[PDB]
Tab-separated table of C-alpha atoms and ligand atoms in Angstrom:
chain	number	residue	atom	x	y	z
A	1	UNK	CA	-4.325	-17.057	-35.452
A	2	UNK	CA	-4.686	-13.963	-37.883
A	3	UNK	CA	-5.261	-11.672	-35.393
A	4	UNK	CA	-2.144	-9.925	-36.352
A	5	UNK	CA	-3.859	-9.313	-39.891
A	6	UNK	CA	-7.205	-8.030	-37.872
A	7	UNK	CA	-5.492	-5.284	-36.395
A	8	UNK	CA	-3.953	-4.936	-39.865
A	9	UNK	CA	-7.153	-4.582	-41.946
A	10	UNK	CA	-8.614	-2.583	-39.272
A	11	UNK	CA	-5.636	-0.317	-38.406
A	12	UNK	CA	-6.272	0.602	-41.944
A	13	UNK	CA	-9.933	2.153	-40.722
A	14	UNK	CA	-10.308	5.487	-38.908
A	15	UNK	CA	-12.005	5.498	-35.322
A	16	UNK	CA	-15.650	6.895	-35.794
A	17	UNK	CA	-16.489	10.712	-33.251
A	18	UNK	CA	-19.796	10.855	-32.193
A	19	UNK	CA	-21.886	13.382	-30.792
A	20	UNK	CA	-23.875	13.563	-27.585
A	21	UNK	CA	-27.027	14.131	-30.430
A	22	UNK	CA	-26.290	10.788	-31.949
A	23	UNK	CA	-25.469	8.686	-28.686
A	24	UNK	CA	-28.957	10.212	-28.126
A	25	UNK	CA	-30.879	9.621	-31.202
A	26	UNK	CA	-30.133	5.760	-30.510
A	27	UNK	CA	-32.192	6.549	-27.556
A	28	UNK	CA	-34.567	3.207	-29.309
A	29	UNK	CA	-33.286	4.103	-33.288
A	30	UNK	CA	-32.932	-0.252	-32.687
A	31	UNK	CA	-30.196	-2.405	-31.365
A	32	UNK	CA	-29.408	-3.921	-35.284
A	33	UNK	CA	-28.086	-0.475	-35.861
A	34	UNK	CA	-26.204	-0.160	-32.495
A	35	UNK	CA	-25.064	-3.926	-33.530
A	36	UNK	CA	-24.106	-3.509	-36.986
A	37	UNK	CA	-22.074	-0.383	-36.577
A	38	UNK	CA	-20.152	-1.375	-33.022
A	39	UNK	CA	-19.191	-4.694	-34.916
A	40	UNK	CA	-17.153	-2.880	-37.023
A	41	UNK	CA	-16.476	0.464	-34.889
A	42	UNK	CA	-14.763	-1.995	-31.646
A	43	UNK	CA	-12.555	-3.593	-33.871
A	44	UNK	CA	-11.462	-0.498	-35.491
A	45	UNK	CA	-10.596	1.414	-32.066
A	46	UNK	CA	-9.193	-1.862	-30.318
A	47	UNK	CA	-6.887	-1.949	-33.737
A	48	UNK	CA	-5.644	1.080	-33.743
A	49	UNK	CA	-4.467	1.371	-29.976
A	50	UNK	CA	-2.893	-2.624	-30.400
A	51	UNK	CA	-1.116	-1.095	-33.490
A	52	UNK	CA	0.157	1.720	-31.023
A	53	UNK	CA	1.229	-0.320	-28.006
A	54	UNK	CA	3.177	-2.467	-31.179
A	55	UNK	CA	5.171	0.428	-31.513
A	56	UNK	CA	6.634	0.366	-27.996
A	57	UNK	CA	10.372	-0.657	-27.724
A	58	UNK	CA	10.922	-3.774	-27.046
A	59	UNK	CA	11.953	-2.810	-23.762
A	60	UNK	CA	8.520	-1.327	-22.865
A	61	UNK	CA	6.451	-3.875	-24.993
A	62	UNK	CA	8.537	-7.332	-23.846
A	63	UNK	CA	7.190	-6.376	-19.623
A	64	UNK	CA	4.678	-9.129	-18.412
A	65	UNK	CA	2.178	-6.095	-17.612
A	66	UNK	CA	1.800	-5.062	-21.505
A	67	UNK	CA	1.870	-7.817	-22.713
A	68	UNK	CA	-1.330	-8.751	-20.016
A	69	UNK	CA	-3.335	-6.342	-21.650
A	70	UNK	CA	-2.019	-6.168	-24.817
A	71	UNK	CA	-3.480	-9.996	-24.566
A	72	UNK	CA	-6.964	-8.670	-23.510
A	73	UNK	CA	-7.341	-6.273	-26.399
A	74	UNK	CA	-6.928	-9.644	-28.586
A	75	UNK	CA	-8.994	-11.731	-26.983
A	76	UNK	CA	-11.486	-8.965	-26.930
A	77	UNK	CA	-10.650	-8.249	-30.816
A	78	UNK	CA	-11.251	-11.922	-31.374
A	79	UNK	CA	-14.475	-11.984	-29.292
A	80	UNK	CA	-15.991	-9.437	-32.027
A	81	UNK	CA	-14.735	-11.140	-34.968
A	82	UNK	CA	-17.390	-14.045	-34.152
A	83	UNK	CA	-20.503	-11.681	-34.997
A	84	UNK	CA	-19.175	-10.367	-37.983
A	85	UNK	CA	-20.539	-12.962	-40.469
A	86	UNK	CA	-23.677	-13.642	-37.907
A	87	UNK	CA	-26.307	-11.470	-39.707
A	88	UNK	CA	-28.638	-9.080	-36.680
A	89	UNK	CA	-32.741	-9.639	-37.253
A	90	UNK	CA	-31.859	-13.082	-34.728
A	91	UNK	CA	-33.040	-11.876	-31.094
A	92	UNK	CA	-30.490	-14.506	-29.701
A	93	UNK	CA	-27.132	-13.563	-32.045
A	94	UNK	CA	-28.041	-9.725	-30.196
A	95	UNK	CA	-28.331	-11.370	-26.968
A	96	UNK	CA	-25.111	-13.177	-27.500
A	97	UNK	CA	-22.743	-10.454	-28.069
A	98	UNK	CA	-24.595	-8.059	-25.512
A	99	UNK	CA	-22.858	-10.779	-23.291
A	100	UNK	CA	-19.582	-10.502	-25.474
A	101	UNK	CA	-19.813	-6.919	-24.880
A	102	UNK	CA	-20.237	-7.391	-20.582
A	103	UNK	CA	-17.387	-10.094	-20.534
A	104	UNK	CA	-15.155	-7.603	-22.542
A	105	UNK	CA	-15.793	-4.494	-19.648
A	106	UNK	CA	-15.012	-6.797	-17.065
A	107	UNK	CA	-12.029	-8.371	-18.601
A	108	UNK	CA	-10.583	-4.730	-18.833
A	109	UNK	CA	-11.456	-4.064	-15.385
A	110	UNK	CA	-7.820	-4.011	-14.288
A	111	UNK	CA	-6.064	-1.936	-16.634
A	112	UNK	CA	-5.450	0.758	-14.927
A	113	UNK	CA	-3.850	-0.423	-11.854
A	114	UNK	CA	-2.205	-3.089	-14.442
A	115	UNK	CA	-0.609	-0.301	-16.528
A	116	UNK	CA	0.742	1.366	-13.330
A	117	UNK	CA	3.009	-1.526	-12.567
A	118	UNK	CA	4.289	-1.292	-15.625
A	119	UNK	CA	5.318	2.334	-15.083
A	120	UNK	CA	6.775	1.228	-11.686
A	121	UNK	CA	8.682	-1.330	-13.284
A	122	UNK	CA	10.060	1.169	-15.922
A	123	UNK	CA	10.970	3.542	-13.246
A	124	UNK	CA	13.259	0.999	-11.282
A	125	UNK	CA	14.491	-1.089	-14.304
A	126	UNK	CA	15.836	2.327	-16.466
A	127	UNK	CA	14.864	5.460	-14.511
A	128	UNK	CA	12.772	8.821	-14.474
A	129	UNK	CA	14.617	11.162	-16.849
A	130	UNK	CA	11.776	13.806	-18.326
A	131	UNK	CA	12.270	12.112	-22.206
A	132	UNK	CA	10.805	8.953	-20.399
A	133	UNK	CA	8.324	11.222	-18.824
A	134	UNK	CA	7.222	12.584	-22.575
A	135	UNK	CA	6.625	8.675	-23.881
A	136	UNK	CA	4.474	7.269	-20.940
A	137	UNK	CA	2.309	11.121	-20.897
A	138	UNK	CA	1.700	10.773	-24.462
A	139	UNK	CA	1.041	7.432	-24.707
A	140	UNK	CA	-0.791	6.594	-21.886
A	141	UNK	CA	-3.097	9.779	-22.474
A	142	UNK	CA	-4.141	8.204	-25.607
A	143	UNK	CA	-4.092	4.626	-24.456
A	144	UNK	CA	-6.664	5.713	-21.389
A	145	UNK	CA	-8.506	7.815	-23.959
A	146	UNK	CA	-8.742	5.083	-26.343
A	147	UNK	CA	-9.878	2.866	-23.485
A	148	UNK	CA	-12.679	5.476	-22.322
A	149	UNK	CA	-14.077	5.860	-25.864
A	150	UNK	CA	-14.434	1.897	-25.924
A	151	UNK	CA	-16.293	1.815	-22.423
A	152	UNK	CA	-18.527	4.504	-23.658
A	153	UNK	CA	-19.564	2.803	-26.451
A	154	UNK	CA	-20.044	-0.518	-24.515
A	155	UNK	CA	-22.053	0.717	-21.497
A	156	UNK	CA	-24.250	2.732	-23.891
A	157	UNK	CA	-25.105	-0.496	-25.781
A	158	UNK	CA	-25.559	-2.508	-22.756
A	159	UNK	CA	-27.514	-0.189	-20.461
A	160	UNK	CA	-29.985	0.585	-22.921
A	161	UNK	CA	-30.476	-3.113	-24.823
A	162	UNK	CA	-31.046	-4.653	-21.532
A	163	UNK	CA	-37.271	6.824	-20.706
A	164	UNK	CA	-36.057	9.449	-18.486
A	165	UNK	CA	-31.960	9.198	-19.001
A	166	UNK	CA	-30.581	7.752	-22.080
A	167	UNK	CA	-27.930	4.852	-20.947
A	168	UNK	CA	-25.181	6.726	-19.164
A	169	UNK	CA	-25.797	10.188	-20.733
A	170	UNK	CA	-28.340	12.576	-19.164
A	171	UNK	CA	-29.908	14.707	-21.356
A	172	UNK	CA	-31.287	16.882	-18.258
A	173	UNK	CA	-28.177	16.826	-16.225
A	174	UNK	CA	-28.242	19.201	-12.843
A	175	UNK	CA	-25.081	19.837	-12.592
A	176	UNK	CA	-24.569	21.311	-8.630
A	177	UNK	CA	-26.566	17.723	-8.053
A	178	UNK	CA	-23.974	15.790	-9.193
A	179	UNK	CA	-21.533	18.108	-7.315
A	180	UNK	CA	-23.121	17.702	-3.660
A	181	UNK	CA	-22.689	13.958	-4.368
A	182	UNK	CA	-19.247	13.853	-5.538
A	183	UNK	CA	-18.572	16.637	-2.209
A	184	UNK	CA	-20.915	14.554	0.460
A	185	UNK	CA	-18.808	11.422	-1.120
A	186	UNK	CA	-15.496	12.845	-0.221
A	187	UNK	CA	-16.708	14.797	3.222
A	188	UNK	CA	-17.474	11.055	4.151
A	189	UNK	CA	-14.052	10.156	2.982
A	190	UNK	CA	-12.862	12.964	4.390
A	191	UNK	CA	-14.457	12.951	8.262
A	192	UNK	CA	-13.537	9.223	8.626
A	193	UNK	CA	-9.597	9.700	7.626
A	194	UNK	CA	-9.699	13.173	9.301
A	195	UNK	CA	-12.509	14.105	11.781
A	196	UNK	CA	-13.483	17.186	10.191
A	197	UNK	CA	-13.725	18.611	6.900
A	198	UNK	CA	-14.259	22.191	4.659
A	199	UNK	CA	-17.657	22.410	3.915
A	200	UNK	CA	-19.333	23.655	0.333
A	201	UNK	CA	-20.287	26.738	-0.558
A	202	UNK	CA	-21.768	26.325	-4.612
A	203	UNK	CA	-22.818	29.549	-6.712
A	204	UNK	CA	-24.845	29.403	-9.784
A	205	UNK	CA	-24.358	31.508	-13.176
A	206	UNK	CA	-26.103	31.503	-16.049
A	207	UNK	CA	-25.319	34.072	-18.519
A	208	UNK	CA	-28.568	34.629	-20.798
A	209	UNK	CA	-31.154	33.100	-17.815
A	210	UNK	CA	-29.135	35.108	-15.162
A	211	UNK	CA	-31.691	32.653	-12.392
A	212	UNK	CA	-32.303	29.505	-14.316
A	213	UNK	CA	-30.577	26.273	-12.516
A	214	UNK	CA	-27.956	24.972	-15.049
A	215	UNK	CA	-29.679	21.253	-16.439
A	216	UNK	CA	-26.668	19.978	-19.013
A	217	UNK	CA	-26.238	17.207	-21.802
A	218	UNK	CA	-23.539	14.803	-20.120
A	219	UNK	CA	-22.118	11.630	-18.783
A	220	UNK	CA	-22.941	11.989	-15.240
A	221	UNK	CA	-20.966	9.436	-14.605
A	222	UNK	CA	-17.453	11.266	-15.700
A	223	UNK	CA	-18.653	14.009	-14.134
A	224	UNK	CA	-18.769	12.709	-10.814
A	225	UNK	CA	-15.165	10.730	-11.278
A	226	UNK	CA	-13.756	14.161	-12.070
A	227	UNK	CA	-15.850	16.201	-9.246
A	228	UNK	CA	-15.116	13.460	-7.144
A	229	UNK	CA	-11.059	13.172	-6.844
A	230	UNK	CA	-10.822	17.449	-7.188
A	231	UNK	CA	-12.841	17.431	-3.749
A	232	UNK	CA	-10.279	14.490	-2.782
A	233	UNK	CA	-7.301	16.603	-3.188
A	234	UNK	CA	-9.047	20.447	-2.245
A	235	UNK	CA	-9.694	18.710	1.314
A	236	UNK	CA	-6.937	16.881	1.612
A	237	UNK	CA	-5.021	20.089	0.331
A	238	UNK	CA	-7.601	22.272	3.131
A	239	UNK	CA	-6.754	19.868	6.383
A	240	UNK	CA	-2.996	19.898	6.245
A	241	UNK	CA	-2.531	23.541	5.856
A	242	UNK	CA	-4.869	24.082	8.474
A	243	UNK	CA	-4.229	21.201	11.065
A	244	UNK	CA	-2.061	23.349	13.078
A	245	UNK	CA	-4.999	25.596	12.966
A	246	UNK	CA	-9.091	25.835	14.192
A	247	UNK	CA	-11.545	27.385	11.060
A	248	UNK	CA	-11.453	25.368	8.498
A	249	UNK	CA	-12.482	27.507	5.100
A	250	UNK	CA	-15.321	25.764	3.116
A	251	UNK	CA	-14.491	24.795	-0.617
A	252	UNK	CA	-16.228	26.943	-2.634
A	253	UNK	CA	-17.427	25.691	-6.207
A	254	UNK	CA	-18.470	27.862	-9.136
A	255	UNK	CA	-20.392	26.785	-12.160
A	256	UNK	CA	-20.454	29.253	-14.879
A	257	UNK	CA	-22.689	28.466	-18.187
A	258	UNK	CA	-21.798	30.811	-21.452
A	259	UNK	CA	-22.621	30.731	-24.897
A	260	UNK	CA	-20.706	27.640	-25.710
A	261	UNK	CA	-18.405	27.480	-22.014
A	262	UNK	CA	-19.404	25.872	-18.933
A	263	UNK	CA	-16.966	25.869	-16.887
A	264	UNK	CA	-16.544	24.753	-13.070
A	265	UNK	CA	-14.401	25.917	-10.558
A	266	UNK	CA	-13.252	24.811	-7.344
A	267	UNK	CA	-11.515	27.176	-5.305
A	268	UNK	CA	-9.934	25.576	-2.072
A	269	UNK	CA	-7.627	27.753	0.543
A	270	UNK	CA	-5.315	24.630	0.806
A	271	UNK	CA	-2.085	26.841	0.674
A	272	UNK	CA	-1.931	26.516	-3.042
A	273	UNK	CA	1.167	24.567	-4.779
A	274	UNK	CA	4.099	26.692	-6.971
A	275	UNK	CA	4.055	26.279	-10.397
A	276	UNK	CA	7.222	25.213	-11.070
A	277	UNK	CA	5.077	21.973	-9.124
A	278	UNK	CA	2.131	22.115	-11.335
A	279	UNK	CA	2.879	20.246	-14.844
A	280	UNK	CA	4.318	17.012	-12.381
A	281	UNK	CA	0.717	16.745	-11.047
A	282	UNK	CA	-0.264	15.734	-14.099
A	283	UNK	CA	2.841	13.288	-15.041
A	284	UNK	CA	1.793	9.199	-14.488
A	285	UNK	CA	4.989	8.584	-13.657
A	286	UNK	CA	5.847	11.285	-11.399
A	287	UNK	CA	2.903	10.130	-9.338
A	288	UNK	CA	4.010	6.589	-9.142
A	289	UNK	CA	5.210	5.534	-5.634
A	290	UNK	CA	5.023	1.785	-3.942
A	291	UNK	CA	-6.146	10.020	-10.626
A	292	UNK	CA	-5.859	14.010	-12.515
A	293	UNK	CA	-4.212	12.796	-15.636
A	294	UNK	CA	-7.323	10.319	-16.088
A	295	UNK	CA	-9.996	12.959	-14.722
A	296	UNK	CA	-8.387	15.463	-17.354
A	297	UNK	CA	-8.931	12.620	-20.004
A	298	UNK	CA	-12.626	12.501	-19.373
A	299	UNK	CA	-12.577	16.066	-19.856
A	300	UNK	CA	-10.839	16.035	-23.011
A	301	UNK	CA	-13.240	13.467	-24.119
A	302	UNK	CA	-16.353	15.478	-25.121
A	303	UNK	CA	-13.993	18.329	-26.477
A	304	UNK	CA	-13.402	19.978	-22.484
A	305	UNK	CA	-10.500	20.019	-20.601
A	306	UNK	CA	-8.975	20.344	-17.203
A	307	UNK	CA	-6.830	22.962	-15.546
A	308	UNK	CA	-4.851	23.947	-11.882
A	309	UNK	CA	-4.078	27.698	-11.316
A	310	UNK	CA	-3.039	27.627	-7.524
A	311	UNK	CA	-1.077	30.703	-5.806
A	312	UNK	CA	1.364	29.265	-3.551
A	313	UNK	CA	0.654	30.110	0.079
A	314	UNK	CA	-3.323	30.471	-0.440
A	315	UNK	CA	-4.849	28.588	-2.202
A	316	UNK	CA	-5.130	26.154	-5.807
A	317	UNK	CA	-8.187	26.828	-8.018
A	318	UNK	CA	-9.730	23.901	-10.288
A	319	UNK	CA	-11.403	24.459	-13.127
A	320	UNK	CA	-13.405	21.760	-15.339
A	321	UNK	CA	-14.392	23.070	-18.775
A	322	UNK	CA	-16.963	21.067	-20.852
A	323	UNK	CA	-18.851	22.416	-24.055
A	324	UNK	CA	-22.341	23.943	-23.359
A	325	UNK	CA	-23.507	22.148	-26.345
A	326	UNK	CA	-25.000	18.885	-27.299
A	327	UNK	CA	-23.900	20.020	-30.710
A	328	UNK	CA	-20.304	21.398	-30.031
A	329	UNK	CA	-19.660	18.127	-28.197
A	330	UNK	CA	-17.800	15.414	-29.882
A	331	UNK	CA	-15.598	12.407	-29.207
A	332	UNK	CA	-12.085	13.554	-28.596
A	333	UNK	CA	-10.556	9.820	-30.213
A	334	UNK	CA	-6.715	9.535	-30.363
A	335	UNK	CA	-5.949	8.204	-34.304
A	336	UNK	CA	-3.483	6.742	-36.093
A	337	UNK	CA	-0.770	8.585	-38.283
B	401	LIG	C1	4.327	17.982	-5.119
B	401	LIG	O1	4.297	19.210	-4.397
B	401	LIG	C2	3.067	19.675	-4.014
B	401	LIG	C3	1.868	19.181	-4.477
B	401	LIG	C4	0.644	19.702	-4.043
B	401	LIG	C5	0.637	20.743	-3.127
B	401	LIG	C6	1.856	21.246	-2.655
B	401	LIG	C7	3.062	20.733	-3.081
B	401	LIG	O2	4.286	21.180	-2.659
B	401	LIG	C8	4.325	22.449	-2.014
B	401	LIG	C9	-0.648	21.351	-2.618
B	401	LIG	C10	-0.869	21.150	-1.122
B	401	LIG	C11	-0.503	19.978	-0.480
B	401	LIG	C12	-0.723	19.842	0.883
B	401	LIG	C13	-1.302	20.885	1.553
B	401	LIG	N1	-1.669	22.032	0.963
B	401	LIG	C14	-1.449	22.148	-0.355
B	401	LIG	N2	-1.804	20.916	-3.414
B	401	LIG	C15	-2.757	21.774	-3.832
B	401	LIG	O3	-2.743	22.966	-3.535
B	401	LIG	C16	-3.868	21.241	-4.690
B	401	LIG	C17	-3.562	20.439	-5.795
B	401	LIG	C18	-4.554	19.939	-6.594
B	401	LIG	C19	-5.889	20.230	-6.310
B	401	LIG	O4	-6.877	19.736	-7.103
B	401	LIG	C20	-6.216	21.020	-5.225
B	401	LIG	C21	-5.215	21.527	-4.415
B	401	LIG	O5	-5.576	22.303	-3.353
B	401	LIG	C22	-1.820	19.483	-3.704
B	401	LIG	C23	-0.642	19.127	-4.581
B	402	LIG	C1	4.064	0.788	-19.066
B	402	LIG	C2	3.773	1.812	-20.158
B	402	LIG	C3	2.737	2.826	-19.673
B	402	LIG	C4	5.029	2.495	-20.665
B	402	LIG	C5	6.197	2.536	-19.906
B	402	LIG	C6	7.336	3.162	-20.389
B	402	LIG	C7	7.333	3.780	-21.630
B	402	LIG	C8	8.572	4.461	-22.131
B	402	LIG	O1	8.427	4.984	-23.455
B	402	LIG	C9	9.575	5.345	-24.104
B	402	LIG	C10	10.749	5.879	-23.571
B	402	LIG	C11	11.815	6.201	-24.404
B	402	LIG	C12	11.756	6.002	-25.780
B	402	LIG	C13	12.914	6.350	-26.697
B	402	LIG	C14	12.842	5.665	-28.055
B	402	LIG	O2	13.488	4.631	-28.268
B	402	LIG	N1	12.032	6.230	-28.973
B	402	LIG	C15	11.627	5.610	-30.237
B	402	LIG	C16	10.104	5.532	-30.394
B	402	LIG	N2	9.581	6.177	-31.608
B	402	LIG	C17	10.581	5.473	-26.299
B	402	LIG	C18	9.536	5.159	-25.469
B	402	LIG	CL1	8.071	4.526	-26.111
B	402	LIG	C19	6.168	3.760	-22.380
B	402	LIG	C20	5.027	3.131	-21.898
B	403	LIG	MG1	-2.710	23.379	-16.108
């Protein structure tokens, strides 16, 4: 095999940012185009994280759970090669890697919980000292970024070569929508693991249309992932405090829109966490045992990011913070270097 040499010649090549505007304009702007570029694009982001999980230790890298994946990425890799020489125009050599593309997703399914055992492993076999800490967090921020970036462009090919929404980007995205789902999601979580639950109270703000609703340019979907576990831990947070008690305070959720900000707290009264406490809920390995880090990612994807101020003994406040703008909003990629 050469495939050693493909993530050679393509380790050489810098992933590609995008904008929301130009996911968009291949609304359809044709699939040859959304062909002929991926073709080369996949390759060129698998590459670069196989050339960074390469540079693991041999004590990392030789585990049977990287080596899994690390697997994956080549037989993915591989997968790609086969349409490089296949010229587009052909209706069935599109059809045929649409399928490539659908096998690849759900080959890569697992790599999450996969990549977690790995961690565990680490944790038993040579410890938690904060240096090891430093590795995994900066590595597996980028390896989950990476990963993201390669879904996106997958599911964006796929949904639309299979009109209101444009593949998994809304162009007309209401944003307190998406939060009663992700909120009625994890009430129903909630109630079944709990028998109660805070309720919502959401509040509006839109600088320059001071009454407007808020409509967005996003991934709904990433949206709702993130929404969804910061309701998971505000009632969790909400219930335990306040077990020994009767009123249950709601979780209130603000959504501020600014010039190029907006930004979306959630406020719970959960009696809060210290901050000494605060960087560890971010750590993958500090949060390994027999969800943030990941929701932060998403964040961080389209040039937000993710943040906890809590006050110990009241109550933790969690703000999302995504770029107004279709323009200012651009694939975070981890490169090479
Ligand atoms: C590891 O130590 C601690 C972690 C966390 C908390 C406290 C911790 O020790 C004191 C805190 C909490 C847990 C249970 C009940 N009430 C609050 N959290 C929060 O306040 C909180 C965290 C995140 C979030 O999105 C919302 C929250 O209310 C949970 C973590
Ligand atoms: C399972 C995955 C997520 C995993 C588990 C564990 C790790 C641990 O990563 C470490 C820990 C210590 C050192 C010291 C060193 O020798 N530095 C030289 C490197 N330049 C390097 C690395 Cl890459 C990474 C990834
Ligand atoms: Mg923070």
């Amino acid at each position: 095999g050469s495939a050693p040499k493909y993530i050679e010649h393509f380790s050489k090549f810098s992933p590609s940012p995008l904008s929301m505007k130009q996911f968009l304009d291949f609304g359809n702007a044709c699939e040859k185009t959304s062909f002929t570029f991926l073709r080369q694009e996949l390759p060129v982001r698998l590459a670069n994280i196989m050339k960074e999980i390469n540079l693991l230790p041999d004590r990392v890298l030789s585990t049977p759970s990287v080596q899994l994946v690390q697997s994956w990425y080549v037989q993915s890799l591989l997968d790609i090669m086969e349409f490089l020489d296949k010229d587009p125009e052909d209706h069935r050599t599109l059809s045929q890697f649409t399928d490539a593309l659908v096998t690849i997703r759900n080959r890569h399914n697992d790599v999450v919980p996969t990549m977690a055992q790995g961690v565990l492993e680490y944790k038993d076999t040579y410890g938690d000292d904060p240096v090891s800490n430093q590795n995994i967090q900066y590595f597996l921020d980028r390896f989950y970024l990476s990963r993201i970036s390669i879904r996106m462009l997958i599911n964006q090919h796929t949904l639309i070569f299979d009109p209101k929404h444009i593949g998994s980007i809304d162009p007309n995205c209401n944003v307190s929508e998406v939060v009663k789902d992700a909120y009625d999601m994890a009430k129903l979580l909630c109630d079944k693991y709990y028998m109660a639950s805070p309720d919502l109270e959401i509040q509006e703000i839109n600088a320059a249309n001071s009454k407007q609703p808020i409509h967005m340019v996003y991934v709904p979907s990433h949206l709702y992932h993130m929404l969804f576990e910061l309701f998971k831990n505000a009632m969790r947070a909400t219930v335990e405090s306040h077990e020994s008690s009767l009123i249950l305070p709601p979780i209130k959720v603000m959504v501020a829109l600014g010039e190029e900000d907006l930004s979306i707290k959630m406020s719970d009264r959960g009696g809060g966490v210290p901050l000494r406490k605060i960087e560890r809920l971010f750590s993958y390995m500090y949060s390994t045992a027999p969800g943030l880090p990941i929701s932060r990612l998403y964040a961080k994807y389209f040039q937000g990011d993710l943040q906890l101020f809590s006050m110990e003994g009241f109550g933790t406040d969690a703000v999302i913070y995504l770029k107004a703008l279709s323009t200012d909003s651009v694939e975070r990629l981890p490169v090479y270097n």
